[PDB]
Design a binder for this molecule. Sequence first.
Ligand SMILES: [Mg+2]
Lengths: 184, 747
Amino acid sequence: ETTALVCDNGSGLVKAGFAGDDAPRAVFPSIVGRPRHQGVMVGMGQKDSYVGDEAQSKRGILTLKYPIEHGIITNWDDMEKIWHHTFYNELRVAPEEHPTLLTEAPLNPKANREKMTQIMFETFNVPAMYVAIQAVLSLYASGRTTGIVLDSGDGVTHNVPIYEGYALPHAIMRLDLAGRDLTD
Amino acid sequence: ELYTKYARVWIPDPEEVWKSAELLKDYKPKVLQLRLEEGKDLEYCLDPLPPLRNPDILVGENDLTALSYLHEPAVLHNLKVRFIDSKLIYTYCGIVLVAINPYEQLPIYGEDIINAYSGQNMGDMDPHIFAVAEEAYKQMARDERNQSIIVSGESGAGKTVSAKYAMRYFATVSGSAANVEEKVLASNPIMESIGNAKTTRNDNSSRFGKYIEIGFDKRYRIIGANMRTYLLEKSRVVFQAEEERNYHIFYQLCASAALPEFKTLRLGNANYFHYTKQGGSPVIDGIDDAKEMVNTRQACTLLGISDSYQMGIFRILAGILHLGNVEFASRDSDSCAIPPKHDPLTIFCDLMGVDYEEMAHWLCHRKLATATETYIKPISKLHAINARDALAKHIYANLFNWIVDHVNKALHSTVKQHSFIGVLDIYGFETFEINSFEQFCINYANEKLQQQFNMHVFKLEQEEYMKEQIPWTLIDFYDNQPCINLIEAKMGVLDLLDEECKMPKGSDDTWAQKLYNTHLNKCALFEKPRLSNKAFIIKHFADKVEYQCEGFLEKNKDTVYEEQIKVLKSSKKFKLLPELFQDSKEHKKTVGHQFRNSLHLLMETLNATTPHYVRCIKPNDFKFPFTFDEKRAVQQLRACGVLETIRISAAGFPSRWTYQEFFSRYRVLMKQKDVLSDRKQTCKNVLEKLILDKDKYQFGKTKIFFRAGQVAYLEKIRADKLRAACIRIQKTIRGWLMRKKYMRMRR
Ligand SMILES: [Mg+2]
């Protein structure tokens, strides 16, 4: 079979790899750097902007933007660069070949999924796509069917109660405390 | 209708599956008057007909397709008569050869008979295993394409004797000196010791497919065999149902615990170990495991496995046994520990030459690693037991593949193999009182093989029809692909089992619920047992079989935690254990997915080849020479697919007659006006009068083709004409003779 990609955009980190692996092939910060100084040398091989481990390496020269904050994608031209880097450079796989699975915090704006979908079909030309609630996946990971899950990354924190695989939407709590506000 | 006076009929009977009867008064469109052998009338009733019987000339013929009525009691009668009264143990059905195991030695295997078959064509002779071997041996020479003989049945039926003689035939007609026969025969005790089991219903059942490739050079001198094995039932190593055993080698080893060299193995009795006590049946009556051991070691030494490797093998099997006793204590719902100074693990580490603290750590934990970072995570007592038993199944499967590679090294020859003839020995279709994942796998393999057989027969029939210039559209093709798609395809019964192995808190109950949800009303072949929610029924090729869901999931599961392999590979005490694991998803694959792949390797081996088929049947459960229990034999014939094969053949034109022999037989019905000089036109005329529906026969270039039943019809109407003529003549002679006695009395 063609295995599907799993790409947990999260915030602050991108976690990506193939379905059925036990840990991701790709873990790099979801960060885009642009150079702010005047470049002085000539013939240097200057490059417009850097994604991920590059922007981390050269960070002293750069301005670093996170395109996702509080689990909302706020700049699509950055984000599409991050996906492009994920598929082509880091996984080294053409996404037109096989499906992709994406993860999102609950209760965030409705248009975020529509834009993610539109970009995945139009530009990346993925054959099929799905988006899945992160806190549901944390139960699949911890081997349970009944849980309440405190899932807290960069950007967003939320609680989702799940009983025997029935989610209880009225009880879903979302909170905007996160690693970035502990950092600030 | 032609249920007439003195029509014979078969009637079903509890004690012998069918009894002969004779229809005592004509049928006319509710109840039949039947004369029985036991009593002159006992009466039989017809429901909202009895199977009619073939005429006496046809019964006893060399080929069951020569019969005009094709059905269970006529087949059973022909095999019974040929076996009991003529002591012919070999019979033909279509392409298949049926071998009825006599439990007695016979002169028929002599070298003069080997010469008598050499160079013949297939139909020229009464059937014999040498005639299949010869057909293969000629086709291998006539064409590049390779050949297989496939032998199917229960293991008791004597497939090994068939393969033995097929090799003796190949050796003799090749004129070869070489020495393959002795080595292949001397391999059997080890392959039976490792690969062979005692089931609920048979002792020394074989639980894998063994393929012996007899290699030939460009001149058809023999070159020495390559052995392959497929379909090994790995799950038996760790689980047994009531009064089963696992592979005999464990009981042979435990029986040998007194021998001096096995002192250090610290063995117990065979019920001391968790991987052998579960069946509750340590002793087979009539076998000394303690002595089969010695025959195994002799077979090893004849294949030249050194004494060092033999003690390595038995050291590893004592390893597996002591491993199985290791008993985890749950610390917590999400953690476990091995108790302090646990004795089975101590003896296992002493055997395998590993640090106790590393094995004790890695059995209870597993390692995750991303490229940047790695985490050591504890695992539940359930997962710890599944891991231990997956490691034991992996050590066993590797040891098996290693012993088979040393067999191959002893059997190979340096000459470049130009071509080969394969002998595949495999189990038949299997069905028990209690029915389980082992049988589900066996029945899936037998579905695949029966599909291949139907492919082959259909192809050779399209060839024969184009030989006889008959339109192909008349032969219908019967296809079991809707049943294979029920099992192997996506959302199939295997796919939902692998999907249940990894869904959280999966269980045999919720697997069964997924089965019902997916298939219950959607498929013609899947059914639910009326009174249960924990079983399902597959309408297999040979029969409906009810499988019970309890404990598939625990049998289905393999995952070997790679760090346990990486501990064992580090051993430095003895040579064999590092040797075993020389060459991942392979560790991740479940048992069912491994089996599915091994079966794909088997089918892609046989599809490269031209099949020839044998069937072995066991006539009686008690090994009486030349006795034939109808109740057993019917079951064996169903299990071998012979009956559904015959049912498929009866749909076609089974009965094929040469124009001149037809004319010889039926000139009695033919007016001396009407026989022409032209036989083909003569027969076309006669038959088109005698049987008004033209759909019952076809006029091939060389043969008449009849549907099932019509040759019996022609024989009946011939007999009726001959009887009316005889009555008229003989009554006239009676009246003449008594008229002369009147003239004597007047004188
Ligand atoms: Mg996250």
